[PDB]
Amino acid sequence: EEERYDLVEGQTLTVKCPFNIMKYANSQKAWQRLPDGKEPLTLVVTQRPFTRPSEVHMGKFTLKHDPSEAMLQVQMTDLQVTDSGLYRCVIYHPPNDPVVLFHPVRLVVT
């Protein structure tokens, strides 16, 4: 179910994650990394009010919340080989289990 994204170091990863607006208009969203045998790492989250279009920066991560297109877009800039790993976009609502959007992204940076 994971999709491979093969990129060269220095490139920017862009991932478009649709979300169901009827269900998740007023929910927080997040980008997570999934290290093997560890808890998900939440890398960047949207901010309140959760229904509003937004763009948040957190280090090399950018999350664009585009409800007009029922879309969350994630960008990671200046990729390094050590960014290689499994990631996902989610509906974020702890302590409830995240709802996975789209499909997991297997990022391979060389």
Q: Which residues bind Zn ion (CB under 5 A)?
A: 9, 27, 93, 110
CB closer to Zn ion out of 34 and 99? 99
CB of 33 to Zn ion, least distance (A): 20
**In whole angstroms, how far apart are CA 69 and each of 19, 65, 72?**
9, 9, 9
CB closer to Zn ion out of 7 and 71? 7
| Residue nearest Zn ion, CB atom distance | 93
CB closer to Zn ion out of 57 and 102? 102
Q: Residue 23, CB half-sphere, CA atoms under 13 Å: how many?
A: 10
